Design a protein around this ligand. Structure first.
Ligand code: FAD
Ligand code: NAP
Length: 246
């Protein structure tokens, strides 16, 4: 039939005036791999409006959960800001994306680097039991401007205490637990991330995922290349995978 189904908003949590999570009903035949994104839409008059969102919830969960930054004057943000439980929302029948760490042949330490809402796919990746089994450590570095935007801080930090480490980065204000004042590319360059994790990072043992602001992705990729890392390819195992968070 159609390329999408009509689902319902099950709930909406307004963590801050600009940051929301929400959940939608999940058709039994909707399958995705941790790290992928859905396309969500609404009827817009006689037409549609569609956007991509990384699935935050686990592959095995019975709902679909998402995490959205409300963009000033954004068309989809405007709908998200007024949507309520019970509203109809459209779910494209197909999930997409290549942020798939199991494609890495080996590696001792998985390091996921994200900004803002780009944390979303890594939250779903964190639920896959085999990811934790194949990596000696799994690390998540999350960069936001202010600590109030670290909305998953409480539980990620609870999961950190085969090890899992969470390092918050706040670029425009201090945060006690993690790194403050500096963006991820510089924190890779000056050894701060390597020191924060207590794990030496090398091309031989470290595998990188990057998701977030496109300028951050380019800057991080360039920094890693200068440090001897390589892009994962169809025929080269490599040590870097990346996806623009928007
Ligand atoms: C593969 C992919 C995955 C995505 N996953 C998510 C997700 O999990 N969560 C999410 O919030 N958005 C996600 N986005 C972006 C999302 O699809 C929309 O762009 C976003 O919801 C804003 O839509 P809008 O209509 O309100 O404004 P738009 O017209 O779509 O965007 C206006 C501008 O706002 C900025 N912007 C848009 N989205 C973001 C963002 N999330 N963070 C920072 N700046 C942004 C950009 O400069 C953009 O040009 C993803 C985009 C892609 C391509
Ligand atoms: N949050 C911001 O600082 C900021 C700035 C300009 C516009 N906006 C707008 O505000 C809305 C919300 O955005 P957001 O804060 O969720 O997303 P964001 O602008 O992408 O910021 C999230 C994180 O990404 C970092 N970052 C940005 N560019 C980077 C780069 N080139 N290299 C490395 N790290 C980089 C930011 O550092 P910094 O804090 O140092 O930028 C911040 O830590 C969007 O409409 C966005 O366009 C936000």
């Amino acid at each position: 039939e159609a390329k999408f189904t009509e689902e319902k908003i099950l709930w909406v949590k307004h963590h801050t005036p600009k940051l929301i999570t929400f959940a939608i009903s999940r058709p039994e035949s909707y399958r995705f791999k941790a790290g992928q994104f859905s396309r969500l839409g609404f009827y817009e008059g006689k037409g549609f409006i569609w956007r991509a969102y990384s699935v935050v919830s686990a592959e095995y969960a019975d709902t679909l959960e998402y995490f959205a930054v409300l963009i000033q004057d954004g068309p989809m943000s405007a709908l998200f800001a007024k949507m309520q439980q019970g509203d109809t929302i459209l779910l494209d029948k197909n999930a997409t994306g290549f942020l798939l760490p199991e494609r890495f042949p080996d590696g001792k330490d998985l390091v996921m680097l994200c900004t803002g809402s780009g944390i979303a796919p890594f939250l779903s990746i964190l639920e896959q039991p085999e990811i934790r089994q194949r990596f000696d450590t799994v690390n998540l570095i999350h960069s936001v401007s202010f600590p109030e935007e670290l909305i998953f801080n409480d539980r990620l930090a609870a999961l950190s205490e085969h090890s899992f480490r969470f390092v918050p980065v706040t670029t425009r204000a201090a945060n006690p637990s993690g790194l403050s004042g500096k963006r991820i590319p510089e924190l890779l360059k000056n050894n701060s991330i390597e020191q924060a994790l207590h794990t030496k990072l090398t091309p031989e043992s470290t595998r990188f995922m990057i998701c977030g602001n496109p300028e951050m992705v380019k800057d991080t990729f360039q920094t890693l290349l200068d440090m001897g890392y390589a892009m994962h390819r169809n025929r080269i195992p490599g040590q870097i995978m990346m996806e623009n968070g928007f």
